[PDB]
Amino acid sequence: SRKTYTLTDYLKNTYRLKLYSLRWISDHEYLYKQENNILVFNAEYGNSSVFLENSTFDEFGHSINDYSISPDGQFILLEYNYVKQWRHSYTASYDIYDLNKRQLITEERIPNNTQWVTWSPVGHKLAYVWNNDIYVKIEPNLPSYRITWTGKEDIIYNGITDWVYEEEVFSAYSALWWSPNGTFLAYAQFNDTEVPLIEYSFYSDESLQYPKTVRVPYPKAGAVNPTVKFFVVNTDSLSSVTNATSIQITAPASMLIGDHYLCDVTWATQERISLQWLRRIQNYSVMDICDYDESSGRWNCLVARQHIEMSTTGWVGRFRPSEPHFTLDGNSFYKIISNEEGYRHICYFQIDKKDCTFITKGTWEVIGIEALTSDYLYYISNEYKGMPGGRNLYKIQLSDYTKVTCLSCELNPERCQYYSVSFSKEAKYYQLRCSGPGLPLYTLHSSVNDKGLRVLEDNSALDKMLQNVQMPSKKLDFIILNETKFWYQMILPPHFDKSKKYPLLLDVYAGPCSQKADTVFRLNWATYLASTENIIVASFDGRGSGYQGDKIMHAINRRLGTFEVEDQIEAARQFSKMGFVDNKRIAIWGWSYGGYVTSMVLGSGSGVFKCGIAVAPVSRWEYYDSVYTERYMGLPTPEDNLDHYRNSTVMSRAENFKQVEYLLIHGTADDNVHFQQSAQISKALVDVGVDFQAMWYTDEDHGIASSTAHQHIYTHMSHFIKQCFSLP
Numbered sequence: 001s002r003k004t005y006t007l008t009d010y011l012k013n014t015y016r017l018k019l020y021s022l023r024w025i026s027d028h029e030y031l032y033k034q035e036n037n038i039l040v041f042n043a044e045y046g047n048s049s050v051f052l053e054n055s056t057f058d059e060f061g062h063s064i065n066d067y068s069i070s071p072d073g074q075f076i077l078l079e080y081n082y083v084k085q086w087r088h089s090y091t092a093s094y095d096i097y098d099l100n101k102r103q104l105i106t107e108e109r110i111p112n113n114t115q116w117v118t119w120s121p122v123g124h125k126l127a128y129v130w131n132n133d134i135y136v137k138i139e140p141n142l143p144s145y146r147i148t149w150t151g152k153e154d155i156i157y158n159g160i161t162d163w164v165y166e167e168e169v170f171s172a173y174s175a176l177w178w179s180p181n182g183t184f185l186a187y188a189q190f191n192d193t194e195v196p197l198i199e200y201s202f203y204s205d206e207s208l209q210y211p212k213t214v215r216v217p218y219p220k221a222g223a224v225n226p227t228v229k230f231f232v233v234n235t236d237s238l239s240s241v242t243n244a245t246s247i248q249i250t251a252p253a254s255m256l257i258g259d260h261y262l263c264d265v266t267w268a269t270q271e272r273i274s275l276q277w278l279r280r281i282q283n284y285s286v287m288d289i290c291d292y293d294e295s296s297g298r299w300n301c302l303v304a305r306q307h308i309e310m311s312t313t314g315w316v317g318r319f320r321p322s323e324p325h326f327t328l329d330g331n332s333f334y335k336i337i338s339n340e341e342g343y344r345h346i347c348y349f350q351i352d353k354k355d356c357t358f359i360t361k362g363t364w365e366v367i368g369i370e371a372l373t374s375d376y377l378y379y380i381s382n383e384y385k386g387m388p389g390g391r392n393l394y395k396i397q398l399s400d401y402t403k404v405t406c407l408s409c410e411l412n413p414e415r416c417q418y419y420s421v422s423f424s425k426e427a428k429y430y431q432l433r434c435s436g437p438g439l440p441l442y443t444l445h446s447s448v449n450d451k452g453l454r455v456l457e458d459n460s461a462l463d464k465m466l467q468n469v470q471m472p473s474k475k476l477d478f479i480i481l482n483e484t485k486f487w488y489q490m491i492l493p494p495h496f497d498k499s500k501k502y503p504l505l506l507d508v509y510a511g512p513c514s515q516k517a518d519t520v521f522r523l524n525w526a527t528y529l530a531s532t533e534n535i536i537v538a539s540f541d542g543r544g545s546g547y548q549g550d551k552i553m554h555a556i557n558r559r560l561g562t563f564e565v566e567d568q569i570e571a572a573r574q575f576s577k578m579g580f581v582d583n584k585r586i587a588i589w590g591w592s593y594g595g596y597v598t599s600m601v602l603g604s605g606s607g608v609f610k611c612g613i614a615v616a617p618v619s620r621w622e623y624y625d626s627v628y629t630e631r632y633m634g635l636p637t638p639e640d641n642l643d644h645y646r647n648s649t650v651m652s653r654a655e656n657f658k659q660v661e662y663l664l665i666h667g668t669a670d671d672n673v674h675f676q677q678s679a680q681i682s683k684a685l686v687d688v689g690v691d692f693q694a695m696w697y698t699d700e701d702h703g704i705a706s707s708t709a710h711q712h713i714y715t716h717m718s719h720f721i722k723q724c725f726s727l728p
């Protein structure tokens with residue numbers, strides 16, 4: 001087809017994937033921006049009209065980064081000076097603009113360096129956090145009220161997560177939760193006083209004479225943890241004479257016993273909150289149901305409503321206990337639970353009652369609960385064709401659990417085996433969103449008989465661009481190990497001719513619950529080694545991997561660095577026993593858990609691998625954070641699990657590295673996996689005499705995501721691999 005997918009094509013992004021990011025603002029309408037204007041859409045008719053032009057803000061006087069219109073649609077929130085902190089957090093400066101009156105707001109603007117902002121889910125209220133303090137703002141142009149005063153950088157946090165609860169718990173900077181009404185504001189505060197500090201240099205620009213020190217409250221395995229504290233503030237009751245009386249909802253008795261975390265918050269009604277907690281040993285967690293006492297202004301959580309959730313095989317829930325979905329009336333809910341067979345399914349809960357009732361079952365898992373009406377429960381699963389790296393949207397009949405309809409399976413069977421969805425308020429309508437193995441598809445459906453209204457986006461354009469490239473093909477299959485099935489994928493060179501030996505790259509991640517074999521269509525680096533450098537990119541999901549039941553996802557319990565590494569290798573073993581793989585030219589590269597497994601699989605001394613690259617890898621588990629690690633390893637003490645904290649370090653395999661060509665890489669500014677992890681790696685290698693290649697990336701953090709550094713690293717990983725596989 002003449003040209004190939006070019007390395008600069010991945011880098012400079014010459015083939016762009018169209019999406020369809022819309023925004024419901026009622027049960028039948030959504031926002032979507034065509035070119036640069038904001039159009040609103042009727043979902044049952046497709047008709048649209050312009051809500052705001054592209055040219056409205058041409059004299060704003062600030063680069064606009066992101067907007068946020070309010071529910072009543074009477075005000076838009078504009079984000080500028082966006083400055084990035086960790087994986088999700090940041091400060092930003094904001095402005096509010098009135099679209100009834102046609103002008104910007106000047107009375108009491110949101111303060112600069114604001115950490116989080118959000119609208120109430122109704123009308124136009126405001127809450128936000130500045131210097132670790134929560135402020136509400138009934139009206140956009142009246143004085144905001146001050147909800148907490150404990151705020152204190154790096155120590156006290158109000159309505160925003162400290163660092164572990166950002167990364168490991170909520171995957172979010174925010175610790176704020178509105179009442180569907182808007183009436184109540186629920187929020188957490190964590191105390192990082194006694195949390196130890198991780199320290200490193202940030203070199204900044206050349207002008208900077210002396211390098212800076214970044215210090216971060218970050219608890220490593222075993223260390224003192226942040227505590228937490230939960231409150232709920234009545235917002236239709238504030239006032240500027242008095243200050244605000246948050247009510248504190250105290251954790252359950254079986255948690256107050258030793259360290260624990262808040263792990264879920266899910267409002268249930270205008271007057272009833274649902275929270276979970278999880279002991280610092282994370283095989284045990286408690287759900288609590290709390291209602292507003294109209295007459296006292298208090299909240300109560302009766303033990304009758306308390307619900308336990310245990311694991312004797314490992315930890316609880318995939319990366320944490322599932323979110324509950326409640327019925328309109330709040331007296332009952334649905335939530336994914338590992339069943340008797342260890343497979344994760346939708347169990348049904350009546351608030352007052354013992355047990356729960358399962359309603360799904362089988363050798364396959366439900367992925368998430370997606371929506372709930374009075375007839376049907378909508379959810380995503382991988383049942384179809386025993387295909388665990390696949391996703392379809394399904395419905396259950398509330399009155400007859402037996403009637404289960406697949407909603408996405410047959411829409412586009414050849415293009416589309418991997419969906420996510422987005423429902424409108426009340427679940428009147430929905431967007432199905434398709435990511436492969438063909439190009440993306442965004443289509444609109446109506447939940448009444450599940451009619452097929454409209455095609456939003458179909459990537460038409462991308463399509464015919466790609467026809468003009470020697471794109472690679474993809475292979476989803478399985479191999480049997482004991483007599484268990486483990487799937488894998490391969491990216492295969494154009495005109496794959498299975499009678500030629502093709503050099504082979506093993507791209508791993510392979511941490512608890514991960515899945516690198518699937519049907520998603522990606523354009524990345526793998527796509528370029530393949531179509532341009534005729535190399536096979538193989539990926540594989542072994543023990544410890546996800547979405548195929550707890551025997552497989554819990555095999556690695558307490559034994560990180562064991563079977564997950566083991567399997568990876570036998571898989572390569574099987575891959576080279578194939579006729580199109582050149583057994584003299586097998587490699588492995590991974591990033592994060594990836595680069596640690598890689599490093600492990602590389603000092604294994606198996607003989608299978610010739611070389612690999614390790615980007616930003618863990619190295620010794622005591623060096624990583626408590627929340628994530630301790631979920632899996634327990635505690636690094638002799639009377640617990642120091643035995644295999646010590647058994648599983650990249651470092652202790654220095655002597656097997658002489659059999660391979662190691663290329664290790666890390667960013668100086670990585671707050672996630674600290675340079676340390678790698679530095680200890682190199683010291684060991686130097687200390688037992690092994691030769692190897694290295695690259696620091698100054699100021700780059702965990703993803704090495706700065707355009708030039710991004711470019712620079714793929715450029716470097718690429719020359720290494722070409723030279724490893726005697727490539728021209």
Ligand SMILES: N[C@@H](CC(=O)N1CCC[C@H]1CNC(=O)c1ccccc1)Cc1ccccc1F
Pocket residue numbers: 167168169171319509511592593618628672673
């Ligand atoms: N801290 C975890 C967070 C995580 O995995 N989470 C948080 C919520 C559940 C799960 C979701 N997965 C990811 O965010 C993730 C991150 C990096 C690579 C792949 C997946 C990410 C991580 C894991 C191992 C080693 C380093 C590292 F940064």
Ligand SMILES: *C1O[C@H](CO)[C@@H](O)[C@H](O)[C@H]1NC(C)=O
Pocket residue numbers: 149242243244
């Ligand atoms: C408002 O209440 C808080 C009590 O937490 C206090 O710290 C703050 O200074 C009070 N301000 C006044 C003077 O009302």
Ligand SMILES: *[C@@H]1O[C@H](CO)[C@@H](O)[C@H](O)[C@H]1NC(C)=O
Pocket residue numbers: 040041042045047048049
């Ligand atoms: C869609 O069509 C109906 C019928 O005119 C109209 O009243 C409605 O306001 C239109 N809205 C949009 C989103 O264009």
Ligand SMILES: *[C@@H]1O[C@H](CO)[C@@H](O)[C@H](O)[C@H]1NC(C)=O
Pocket residue numbers: 093108109110111112
């Ligand atoms: C935000 O900072 C800018 C630039 O320093 C300043 O001009 C503006 O007045 C500030 N706004 C507020 C509300 O502090």
Ligand SMILES: *[C@@H]1O[C@H](CO)[C@@H](O)[C@H](O)[C@H]1NC(C)=O
Pocket residue numbers: 150156191192193194
């Ligand atoms: C944070 O906890 C420490 C003890 O670890 C305590 O002395 C301090 O007052 C706490 N801060 C608040 C306001 O909770």
